[PDB]
Amino acid sequence: GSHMSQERPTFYRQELNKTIWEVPERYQNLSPVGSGAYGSVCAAFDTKTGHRVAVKKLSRPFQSIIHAKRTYRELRLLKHMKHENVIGLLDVFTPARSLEEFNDVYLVTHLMGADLNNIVKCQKLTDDHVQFLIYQILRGLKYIHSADIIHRDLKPSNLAVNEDCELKILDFGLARHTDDEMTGYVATRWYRAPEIMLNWMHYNQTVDIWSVGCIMAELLTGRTLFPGTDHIDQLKLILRLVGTPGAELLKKISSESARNYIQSLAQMPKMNFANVFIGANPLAVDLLEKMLVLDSDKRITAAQALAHAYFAQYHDPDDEPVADPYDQSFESRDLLIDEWKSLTYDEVISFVPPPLD
């Protein structure tokens, strides 16, 4: 038996954050929470499940061809990610009755309550919290990478945490397929892998591992590991810890006109990690040493990291699932702005509500 017919939900309008929000009657009790450059966010009561959700309104998704393509890609990635430690798409909708009426896009996700920044300011985390937090990031990351995707912007504000210390990776705005000639700018300075900052090489998924290292270091010490004030300070901060790279490694990671500058620097050896993270669990220190290396070919992977002894209390190889490969073929097409928009419209319309369990 098949459905011949579909019933559009009933929508209602109200003013929130200086604009009219128009959402299905399914969502009630909307109130603003978050503000960002691209879309305002409201908490809401999801009458379908009885749980609180975040509703993000996108009003500039197709402003330009660049915006439009990025919106399409991001929605496909969002629709793809189904994993406990990765943000899921509970719903996506538009009030538009047709493609011609289409502009605003609303995304609905779980409302977590805090991000990792919040958590850090409110406590010094125990080694157990750290184990469990980083473990979950890595479990989510193994899944994301197995989809052939690089997150590219892991940082505390992109990590949602609840009261029970459960975590989800947020924000796929900058995420890309590994095989891309990378577009988009990762603006985050403190958590960004050196090879990305140098903008010289086609980098790999281990850029996200670097980020995890910076985050873990920060959870252990209670302060940002590499809080550079600019590109130069950021570099010197990093080389101080990890030691200046051999000449060979240099060739691959920087342009000559950068390579030359680096060499211009006073050379420094790799620091003793135990002294930087004094009183940290020795296993944690060992793992940091495997993450925070300049050579991306030697950097430990997510799947490897999960099997590291530091996670012995949590590691379950039978419960660390992988994804289907993401198909990025449409993103090689050269399309006009309206065509990227029509494609996005298709993705919104074809959205399949997750089952209730």
Asked about 127 being catalytic, the answer comes back as: no
With CA atoms as reference, report the closest residue to 113 among 35, 37, 33, 195: 33
- Is position 40 annotated in a ligand binding site? yes
User: CA 209, 213, 216: angle at the middle one, nearest 5?
Assistant: 130
Buried b (16+ CB within 10 A) or exposed e, 216-234: bbbbbeeebbbebeeeeeb
Q: Does residue 190 contact residue 230 with C-beta atoms inside 8 Å?
A: no
Span(s) in the chain for CATH 3.30.200.20: 8-113+323-352
Tokens of 352: 């399949």
Q: Which residues does a chain break follow in the chain (C to N more than 2.5 Å)?
A: none
Say how far apart CA 86 and CA 169 lie, in whole Å: 5
Query: What's the sign of the alpha-carbon dihedral 310, 314, 318, 319?
Result: negative
Question: Could you tell me which residues come within 8 angstroms of residue 233 by beta carbon, excluding any fewer than 6 positions away?
Answer: none
Query: What top-level class would CATH report for the domain 8-113+323-352?
Result: alpha beta
Tokens of 227: 């809080």
Distances 193 to 26, 74, 257 between C-alpha atoms, Å = 42, 22, 19
Say how far apart CA 112 and CA 163 lie, in whole Å: 9
- Is position 270 annotated in a ligand binding site? no
Buried b (16+ CB within 10 A) or exposed e, 120-135: beeeebeeeebbbbbb
Say how far apart CA 344 and CA 103 lie, in whole Å: 10
User: CA 351, 355, 357: angle at the middle one, nearest 5?
Assistant: 160
Say how far apart CA 122 and CA 220 lie, in whole Å: 14
Tokens of 251: 């060739």
How many contiguous H segments (helices) and E segments (strands) does the chain have? 12, 12
Q: How many other CB atoms are there within 10 angstroms of residue 247's CB atom? A: 10
Query: What's the sign of the alpha-carbon dihedral 323, 329, 332, 334?
Result: negative
- Is position 36 annotated in a ligand binding site? yes
Q: Does residue 58 contact residue 21 with C-beta atoms inside 8 Å?
A: no
Q: Does residue 112 contact residue 273 with C-beta atoms inside 8 Å?
A: no
With CA atoms as reference, report the closest residue to 317 among 306, 305, 330: 306
| Angle between helices 127-146 and 282-291 in degrees, nearest 10 | 30
Span(s) in the chain for CATH 1.10.510.10: 114-322
Tokens of 123: 């406590």
Q: Does residue 197 contact residue 188 with C-beta atoms inside 8 Å?
A: no
Q: Which of 91, 104, 153, 171 is catalytic?
A: 171
Say how far apart CA 285 and CA 219 lie, in whole Å: 12
**Cross-strand partners of 83:** 86
Say how far apart CA 8 and CA 146 lie, in whole Å: 36
Greatest C-alpha distance within the chain: 73
- Is position 246 annotated in a ligand binding site? no
- Identify how the structure was determined: X-ray
Architecture of domain 114-322 in this structure: Orthogonal Bundle (1.10)
Q: Are strands 51-58 and 105-110 parallel, antiparallel or unpaired?
A: antiparallel
Q: Which one-letter DSSP state was computed for residue 36?
A: -
- Is position 35 annotated in a ligand binding site? yes
- Is position 329 annotated in a ligand binding site? no
**Cross-strand partners of 45:** 28, 52
What DSSP assignment string belongs to 76-140?
A: HHHHH--BTTB----EEE-S-SSGGG---EEEEEE---EEHHHHHHH-PPPHHHHHHHHHHHHHH
